[PDB]
Curated annotation (Swiss-Prot):
The keyword NADP is assigned to this record: yes
Annotated protein name in UniProt: Dihydrofolate reductase
Species the sequence originates in: Escherichia coli (strain K12)
Pathway participation: Cofactor biosynthesis; tetrahydrofolate biosynthesis; 5,6,7,8-tetrahydrofolate from 7,8-dihydrofolate: step 1/1
Additional note from the record: The strain K12 sequence is shown.
Domain DHFR, residue spans: 1-158
EC number(s) from the headed UniProt entry: 1.5.1.3
Keywords, ordered alphabetically: Antibiotic resistance, Methotrexate resistance, NADP, One-carbon metabolism, Oxidoreductase, Trimethoprim resistance
Cited InterPro entries: DHFR, DHFR-like_dom_sf, DHFR_CS, DHFR_dom
Domain of life: Bacteria
Catalytic reaction list: (6S)-5,6,7,8-tetrahydrofolate + NADP(+) = 7,8-dihydrofolate + NADPH + H(+)
């Protein structure tokens, strides 16, 4: 099955100038816990933003161009990216905006972190249809000394 995982600020903002402006270690820990030992599919811009492989995960990068790093797997279409994952229980799509839009219709599950941050961005999570999704997990956390915004971890399943 295909899942998307993302962290969204106000208005579904997910990035600005090829970075995630906020810094929430608790959310990065959630991301790691939910992606470790699964393939991750990302677009080339997200690959560049992260800047290095994510350890302990098969990293698959979408690009129309030939790859530039054999520590990761390079593919040229959505269907090729899925194939390159092989027979696994769960594929994690890790963005960015353009990649999320293409995988959303194929996805069965969304792992969304809703961050209480105002951020002026240039990239958004898709404007998905709320009626298509059932919330099956929701956990809110207040800000603390390590995490400067409140945030809520949610898992949605396609109805
Ligand atoms: N908050 C979050 O959860 C989160 C998660 C991920 C990323 N981000 C942020 O999102 C931003 C990046 O998102 P983005 O929308 O600009 O870019 P993106 O989706 O990461 O990358 C788009 C690139 O992927 C390739 N690509 C995408 N679909 C393809 C297809 N079907 N076939 C072949 N290649 C394909 C293309 O590379 P070529 O140009 O080489 O063809 C394209 O330019 C950054 O700000 C990043 O920090 C945030
Ligand atoms: N919930 C969520 N939060 C994110 O920040 C996020 N980021 C991306 C893409 N960008 C990134 C950027 C850095 C790392 C990262 O350094 N992760 C380390 C965690 C270090 C830790 O455990 O604190 C990793 O091993 O996953 C992951 C994804 C995609 N989906 C997301 N989803
Ligand atoms: Mn159902």
């Amino acid at each position: 099955m295909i899942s998307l995982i993302a962290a969204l600020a106000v208005d579904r903002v997910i990035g600005m100038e090829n970075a995630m402006p906020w810094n929430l270690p608790a959310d990065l820990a959630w991301f790691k816990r939910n992606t470790l030992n699964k393939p991750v599919i990302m677009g080339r811009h997200t690959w560049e933003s992260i800047g290095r492989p994510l350890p302990g995960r098969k990293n698959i990068i979408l690009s129309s161009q030939p790859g530039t790093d054999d520590r990761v797997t390079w593919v040229k279409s959505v269907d090729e990216a899925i194939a390159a994952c092989g027979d696994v229980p769960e594929i994690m799509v890790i963005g960015g905006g353009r990649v999320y839009e293409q995988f959303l219709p194929k996805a069965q599950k969304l792992y969304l972190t809703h961050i209480d941050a105002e951020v002026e961005g240039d990239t958004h999570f898709p404007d998905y249809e709320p009626d298509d999704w059932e919330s099956v997990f929701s956990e809110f956390h207040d800000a603390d000394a390590q995490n400067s915004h409140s945030y809520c971890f949610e898992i949605l399943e396609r109805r």
